[PDB]
Design a protein around this nucleic acid. Structure first.
Lengths: 178, 178, 178, 178
DNA sequence: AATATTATTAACAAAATAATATT
DNA sequence: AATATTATTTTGTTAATAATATT
DNA sequence: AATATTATTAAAAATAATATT
DNA sequence: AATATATT
DNA sequence: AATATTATTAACAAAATAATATT
DNA sequence: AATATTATTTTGTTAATAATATT
């Protein structure tokens, strides 16, 4: 079993590490998406809709690690700019469904063009281990915790990502294209 | 060299993981600390003050993972409640220095008394790996990325924590007391 | 810099681990191949010849860890039994190259029909960590150390072993065949 | 479940790695001992008996990786050389116990002062990783496999070493002495 | 009753100013 | 040469409820 | 919207009594 | 001899 | 005229469980 | 069981003998 000291020490390490990593990720994500007048949760929302079509607001919240209310308010704002299409189904009218307009695909796609990994801070602070291991780091221990907390459906998102990157995009010149 | 697609795959993966961890950690921090009329960043300041004495507001920003402005305004409020004390020095009258008050140490102590690891969801996510490895996980990769983003001086924090848990607090009655 | 004491600690950990893993693997490998009157090193040489064709005795000894003389002597016996064929070039008549006959390919194929993962104790020894990780362990650390001792040319063997086996073997009735 | 393709990939990877690493450690351990008219398993026995004082032949044939026959024979030879001494006990007479003479304690102490980590090639393989992490590698994955093969009693031979080194030995003059 | 929202109310925490202070 | 460290006062994200329409 | 029963309390055809016819 | 309401 | 290594090929010297008998 | 004798080996060690152009 565990002494109280061991529990306390593990929590303070993992508390400060999560906080540090997330803050650097935040700053960089924001610089990138400050053109186009988008908040971080907004971009998250569109991305989810690309990989999952016809999702529920609540489903959205689950993948997008945000509260359901934040998802509702922001997706309404996204229909105002004309980037998303709401819908409803006859069998049950409680749930509301979300799909992506053509301008949305245009935003996401154009935005992919502008990705420059080098600017991002984590990429650079993780490049040492890439050569040592010949491959980019896979934080299995985080992946284990996070799978336990959030379950096995949540962890589908990663798979879908790699599955979409291959056979829905290609590399030309120095950037990625359809 | 790294192909572009490789960089994008590493980026989305690390992004989703840090968001899921910090969101969980944030929630479980706030619930514990709400009774004392203290926000997350105010608690983080008090903690920095106990482990680093006579710091300057920028230094507690650096350790705290918070901007300079939030440090100042929250440290001011904490002088109002009486938990913290301001100070200044002759070498340079520009810097403002910060120390804890006797109330402050009492507040942090009580917070240690009211600690139940089984409530935090990270802790419970981590136990499965403790059985396999006989000790609580050290996310060496994440620690190494953090050094290259934040520097070695910042990291003194972990060392100081560990040291100052051992000496002043003694385990007794399933509790911690001087 | 390190203390002497820490180095003594690392030596003993790694020297006792290595002895355990090789001793145990040795016992099972011997069992599996004994019906064909074959030494561990001999089966090694046959395998090398499958993956790396037209390879010198120095190459055979490099990839299968062994002295030049062990490789040459044993290979002589394996050309007597008719498993392999000796060939010499028209430039640098010093070098003797090896290839593999249809008899030797027959014995290797037939062995592969007798492979059973559960009798192998190191196989069962891993199943705990395959369940948690979701994939078999990759021991990057050990691989680091081996590569920095033997050089990246040596490690080609692994890659080649991977690709060959995925392309030219399919599973029929639960046993692998061409 | 597991396809037999997966199981073959794992076996071959772990076979090659285990073999390479043990072959390196044999090369260096034999030279460190050869001046003292010793072989590897003999040395291993003297060490065992330093840390586990009263033991049976079967015990030292568990902790040192060897058969019972080898333990009895190599120990007898060491009685002749005068390094070890045999005992027996009334409660159960079939057992035979071993202890270390002062000549044996001497050869072990003499040997300690010929320990030069920079010669041995594994240590040199580990140094990059110590530079990156900040400490020497613990290779947990190997430890789990080995524990799942040899049981927890066997693993005690690690803890005992870590303890003795920290108490009985002392570091001065770039060397380790009582 | 329990399920999916929708519509407000607070509050955390920076982004962007002002101005005192070391040669 | 302007800069460095507060200090003052401007913004926007995001989520914790409270009301509401469907099974 | 879908499921339901326990009650309260309520509101199709024959036959039977009284009324006028 | 005729008629005249409760519960997920 | 000088200057060297390089890759085999032939022989000795070990160890290691494997069966194998006895309080 | 837990020893205490015997038998079968398969990794390695060093000797000897050949093959190449390049300063």
């Amino acid at each position: 079993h565990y002494s109280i000291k061991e529990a306390m020490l593990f929590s303070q390490r993992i508390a400060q590490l999560s906080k540090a990593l997330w803050k650097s990720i935040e700053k960089d994500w924001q610089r990138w998406i400050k053109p186009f007048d988008l908040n971080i949760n907004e971009h998250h929302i569109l991305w989810i809709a690309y990989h999952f079509k016809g999702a529920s607001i609540s489903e959205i919240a689950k993948f997008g690690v945000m509260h359901v209310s934040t998802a509702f308010n922001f997706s309404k704002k996204l229909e105002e700019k004309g980037l998303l299409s709401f819908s409803k189904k006859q069998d049950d009218k409680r749930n509301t469904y979300i799909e992506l307009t053509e301008k949305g695909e245009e935003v996401l796609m154009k935005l992919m063009e502008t990705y420059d990994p080098t600017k991002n801070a984590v990429f650079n602070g993780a490049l040492p281990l890439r050569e040592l291991y010949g491959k980019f780091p896979e934080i299995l221990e985080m992946m284990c915790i996070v799978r336990n907390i959030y379950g096995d459906d949540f962890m589908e998102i990663f798979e879908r990502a790699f599955e979409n990157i291959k056979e829905d995009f290609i590399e030309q010149d120095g950037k990625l294209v359809k």
